[PDB]
Design a protein around this ligand. Structure first.
Ligand SMILES: [Zn+2]
Lengths: 114, 23, 181, 83, 69
RNA sequence: CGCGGGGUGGAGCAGCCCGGUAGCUCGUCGGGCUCAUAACCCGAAGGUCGUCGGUUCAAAUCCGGCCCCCGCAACCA
RNA sequence: GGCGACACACGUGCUACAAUGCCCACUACAAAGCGAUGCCACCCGGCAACGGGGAGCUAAUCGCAAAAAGGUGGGCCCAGUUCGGAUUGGGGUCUGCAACCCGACCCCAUGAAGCCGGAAUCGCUAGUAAUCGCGGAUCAGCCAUGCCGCGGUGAAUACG
RNA sequence: CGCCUCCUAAAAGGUAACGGAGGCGCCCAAAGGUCCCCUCAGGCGGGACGGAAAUCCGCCGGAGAGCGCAAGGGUAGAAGG
């Protein structure tokens, strides 16, 4: 379908774009503007030429699925290499943005371990 | 929810202004 | 038999290009595609969904040729598979279906690959025989996402008349296999 | 981060000592207390022992660490786990 | 070929996002494809398709040189 | 050493006969209740089934060896 | 530099697990307070934070400042979702000499657990509870979901 | 305590010991007959899950595999699939 994935036919295009990794609510409301496409249209109601236009536009305006993930890991991996505190935090699986490690680090630490 | 910045709800609860809650 | 553009590319340019590149004394000295083997070592249907013939149907769609079933050559404790148990499908595409399937592969299958930076330039037998693998089966245009239910990858063993991997990768390169390196 | 409209902050004594070795050839590992300071592209190839609060941690400044603060690389804390 | 088991092949029209038609043989006469060889990144000079930076780091230190020396 | 039996989580025992998956009580951890402790309640964890080889696709679970422990005999004088 | 660590454990709170809902655009309706190196109107730029202009305001008169929920209209259709916003990558604004540890805020993307919570346990008898928002202290800035207050709407139940 | 395998057992066979090792007290309606077809184990390299070891490919292999079960004999120019 689209760059790496598919949007459900039964959903509007706005939510449709969002299922792409690297596409949130913001750009979703944007590609419709830059492609002049009705947001209210379901994916089951989308025309080929509009889609390929959509496909052509968005899939080069940004990198979304694989090309986007690599930069993240590239950024993250290089931090481990540079030994930065940020990278230092990642190598411990700890909250890298200065959060409080003493309590409430579950989202970064997952299951609690007595 | 209230704690979501991107919602105008959040910037109300958070008490801020931005792309999603102008003045 | 039937006409296939890619094979036509083999005769038209690939043959003379290889001959120039190597000066083969005889045209039988130049590489060729013996066959193209397709494997799916499922390892899942052997226990449950033992009629996953639907997967064989997918192979038939991609190949126009129903694959034969491969069973366990012996039982295993770890691999929960008693001997004589279907564990993987297999089809052997040859001349016409060979060039056809390969043509759909390069023209569509590879460019549909997620983050396809190219083929391994190293996945060679050593005898001039290339192998590779897939993690899903919805790459091929015959297969649609609607018809797909589970991602069965596969393996492809393209065998070549050539003796070295040199002339092999030379050939498929002339065939335009996009090598990631 | 620091307002790029505002200048990119680096301590005067730090940068001058940097350019000095840039003037007088790469040498002379530099003690420093300016963890708040930002690495500058000129700093690449230099080695500096940044102070952690107790010691000066010698950090070799490469290009790969230019756009950062110096305190990032002298970890001011010691954690080895539990048990 | 065992006459009755193999799904019969036909001429098959490939249609890319380029609208690229590619005549082949398949079990579907008319077929569309989001991608072809004439559009794939790795075939289109790699094209960068979003980002031509190519490991932008490190610098890329623009907004720099504001130091007083 | 001659015979029979056994040697499973921290403890005591189960699963062995029928090899495809080891369970119970206690105990431990955490929490709850209490002014606190015990009791109690909730939750949680956790077992080369002596040891070594073979049999097996697979052995606690089969086989054989060794070790330990146990019971029985070690006799006619 | 540390007080911000972090295998863990407990308390107190906030946000949710959604349709009596979420989101969006418009229209309301407060109180109580603060403000001269502060409120800053209004203009412009900028997605925005914010920045540049810049009036008034020394205070019932200027501003902070929109109250919010509510009403209106639309979308969403039960979805780990247009719920959820945690984490993280990047790009920025602002204060501050200096935001790495160790600020806040704006923007994109990422979109975690979570489907009402065991044992158990808490507050509340009326404008109370619940929910909605506003102000102030400290303070350059803020780690404030806290605290102290203000108002909006507004319950059930007490046999004993 | 009966029968099978090997050594004992002295190049015929047979050959004892409370000698040294293991087995059997069945099983297969196909594990039987016949025709036709194929050839293993193993090693290396390549191969999504997937591994040491699934299935696939190529390459090297006389049999070291397998041949229902003990051992031996026999065996792919099949008794093996
Ligand atoms: Zn194309």
């Amino acid at each position: 379908r689209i760059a790496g994935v598919e949007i459900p036919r039964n959903k509007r295009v706005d939510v449709a774009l969002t299922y792409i990794y690297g596409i949130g609510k913001a750009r979703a409301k944007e590609a419709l503007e830059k492609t002049g496409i009705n947001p209210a249209t379901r994916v089951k109601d989308l025309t080929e030429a509009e889609v390929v236009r959509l496909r052509e536009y968005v899939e080069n305006t940004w990198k979304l699925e694989g090309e986007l993930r690599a930069e993240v890991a590239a950024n993250i991996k290089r931090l481990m290499d540079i030994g930065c505190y940020r990278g230092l935090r990642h190598r411990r699986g700890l909250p890298v943005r200065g959060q409080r490690t003493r309590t409430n680090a579950r989202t970064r630490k997952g299951p609690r371990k007595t | 929810g209230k704690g979501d910045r991107r919602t105008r709800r959040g910037k109300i609860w958070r008490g801020t202004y931005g792309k999603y809650r102008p003045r | 038999p039937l006409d296939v553009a890619l094979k036509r590319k083999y005769y038209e340019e690939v043959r003379p290009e290889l001959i120039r590149r190597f000066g083969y004394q005889n045209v039988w000295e130049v590489p060729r595609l013996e066959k193209v083997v397709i494997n799916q070592g499922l390892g899942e249907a052997k226990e449950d969904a033992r009629i996953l013939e639907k997967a064989a149907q997918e192979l038939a769609l991609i190949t126009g040729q129903k694959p034969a079933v491969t069973r366990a050559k012996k039982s295993i404790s770890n691999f929960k598979l008693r001997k004589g148990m279907p564990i993987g499908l297999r089809v052997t595409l040859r001349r016409d279906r060979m060039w056809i399937f390969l043509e759909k592969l390069l023209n569509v299958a590879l460019p549909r690959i997620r983050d396809f930076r190219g083929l391994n330039p190293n996945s060679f037998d050593g005898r001039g025989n290339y192998n590779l693998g897939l993690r899903e089966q919805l790459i091929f245009p015959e297969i649609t996402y609607d018809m797909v239910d589970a991602l069965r990858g596969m393996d492809i063993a393209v065998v070549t008349t050539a003796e070295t991997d040199e002339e092999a990768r030379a050939l498929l390169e002339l065939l335009g296999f996009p090598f990631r390196k | 981060p620091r307002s790029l409209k505002k200048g990119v902050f680096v301590d005067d004594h730090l940068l001058e000592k940097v350019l000095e070795l840039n003037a007088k050839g790469e040498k002379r590992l530099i003690k420093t207390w300016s963890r708040r300071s930002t690495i500058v592209p000129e700093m690449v190839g230099h080695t500096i022992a940044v102070y952690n609060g107790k010691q000066h941690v010698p950090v070799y400044i490469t290009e790969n660490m230019v756009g950062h603060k110096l305190g990032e690389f002298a970890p001011t804390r010691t954690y080895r786990g539990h048990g | 070929m065992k006459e009755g088991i193999h799904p019969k092949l036909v001429p098959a029209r490939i249609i890319c996002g380029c609208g690229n038609v590619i005549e082949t043989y398949s079990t579907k006469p008319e077929i569309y494809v989001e991608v072809c060889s004439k559009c794939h990144p790795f075939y289109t000079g790699q094209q960068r398709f979003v980002d031509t930076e190519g490991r932008v780091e490190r610098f890329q230190r623009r907004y720099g040189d504001s130091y007083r020396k």
